[PDB]
Design a protein around this ligand. Sequence first.
Ligand SMILES: *[C@@H]1O[C@H](CO[C@H]2O[C@@H](C)[C@@H](O)[C@@H](O)[C@@H]2O)[C@@H](O[C@@H]2O[C@H](CO)[C@@H](O[C@@H]3O[C@H](CO)[C@@H](O)[C@H](O[C@H]4O[C@H](CO)[C@@H](O)[C@H](O)[C@@H]4O)[C@@H]3O)[C@H](O)[C@H]2NC(C)=O)[C@H](O)[C@H]1NC(C)=O
Ligand SMILES: *[C@@H]1O[C@H](CO)[C@@H](O)[C@H](O)[C@H]1NC(C)=O
Length: 453
Amino acid sequence: GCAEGSCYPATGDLLIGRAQKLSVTSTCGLHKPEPYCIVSHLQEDKKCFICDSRDPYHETLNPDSHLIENVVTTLKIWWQSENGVENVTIQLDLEAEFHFTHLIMTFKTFRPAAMLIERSSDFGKAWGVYRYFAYDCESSFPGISTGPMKKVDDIICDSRYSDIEPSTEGEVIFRALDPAFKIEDPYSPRIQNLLKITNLRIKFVKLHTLGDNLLDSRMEIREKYYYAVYDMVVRGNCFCYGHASECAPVVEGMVHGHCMCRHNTKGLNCELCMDFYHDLPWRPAEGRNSNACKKCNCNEHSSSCHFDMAVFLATGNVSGGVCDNCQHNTMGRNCEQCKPFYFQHPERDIRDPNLCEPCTCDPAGSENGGICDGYTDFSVGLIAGQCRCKLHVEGERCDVCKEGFYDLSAEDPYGCKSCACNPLGTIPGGNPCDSETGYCYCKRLVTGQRCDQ
Ligand SMILES: *[C@@H]1O[C@H](CO[C@H]2O[C@@H](C)[C@@H](O)[C@@H](O)[C@@H]2O)[C@@H](O[C@@H]2O[C@H](CO)[C@@H](O[C@@H]3O[C@H](CO)[C@@H](O)[C@H](O[C@H]4O[C@H](CO)[C@@H](O)[C@H](O)[C@@H]4O)[C@@H]3O)[C@H](O)[C@H]2NC(C)=O)[C@H](O)[C@H]1NC(C)=O
Ligand SMILES: *[C@@H]1O[C@H](CO)[C@@H](O)[C@H](O)[C@H]1NC(C)=O
């Protein structure tokens, strides 16, 4: 179970439950009845019938309809192209984004003379070519390679499925991950650009005529050459990087496309980290390792955080979440400090909403605009609150002139100005002057500010 490590949804047939998503290029009997023939082994004999494909097949009402929706299995139904048409294309459209195992088509007539398979990850915008197939990889597909594959993603031209010999029920097969390889790293960029699929597309380009030149011929010669397909399975699954055990609707036997993520992951494919769980870098599960996204810690002064790789490494791959918009005047990568002009109450829990107290330093007399010590830490000379008074100021809040000085003006570096009280004419003992006026207390028979005159 996911509650024990990595986990993945079941595999299945993508076509099931998705019949109405199939679209063709040619289909005998769409508008008005067309006839056809079933040649045998080397043209021994031929029996012909009619193709009335203008109404959904039914065994006892309309037995000659052969629309593409007839490939999705669950008797003998099928799809069939127009007689003598050599350019037919089938297309599957997925609502979500799935992983592709393998495709298995079984024709009723004679497997294509030559065909190729394409796909799209970016919803029918860009198209990649999985592989080519032919009986003459050189005439039909000049340039494309044959022989062996130099890489697990080499586009080549197969031919083991483009014969004739198998009269009917012949099969075409394609596997995303060429069995002839060892998938070293699963989640790698290339092994991924092989399974990623939203749109499958099969293009037929050559019909086996057994000699006859369909080129301007009697409806008697072409009426026997056409692609017909009994059914086809598109094996695959809904990918969730190990973080989900089952996918939900975006029925029966149907492969769903919405990952029911777990492990604090969120996303259509759980490739993201649930909100506020950005303390470790997102990773896919493996073995019993969930690699579950880790909850951020902002000491309860936020709930918006993001993951920063630099920080992650800086801590030795321990943690990399940094908090956003620290509330309560806190600060720090985890909101574990107080912004200037505030200081941590010596008591209070670091999680307390009021952990941070405002300074009380009088800006004019203090040093550093009146920023107090933010927290206590003897070893360095830090006390929660303590203000740094200027040279000639004193008091818990630095709002007082030291004896002998006056005029606490913020406008100056040291705060107060020396009274400059003459030692002679000034009454000795206690404060020699007014802290405001700067007027010294003079002896008798002496006068004037500085008790000099
Ligand atoms: C702390 O974690 C970081 C983050 O990345 C890892 O995070 C963990 C949680 C998992 O998610 C894990 O899968 C992530 O990789 C680590 O930093 C990264 O470490 C990987 C190690 O594989 C680095 O990848 C390598 O990069 C070099 C240089 O670009 C490549 O050469 C390697 O690929 C080939 O190297 C030679 C080629 O001749 C041959 O051995 C093979 O051909 C190799 O395939 C390989 O890709 C990646 O660059 C690192 N990225 C960062 C973040 O700088 C980090 O190591 C870890 N610290 C610790 C605990 O040591
Ligand atoms: C079929 O493909 C040929 C080239 O191979 C092209 O000339 C022709 O126009 C195509 N016919 C279709 C599908 O309209």
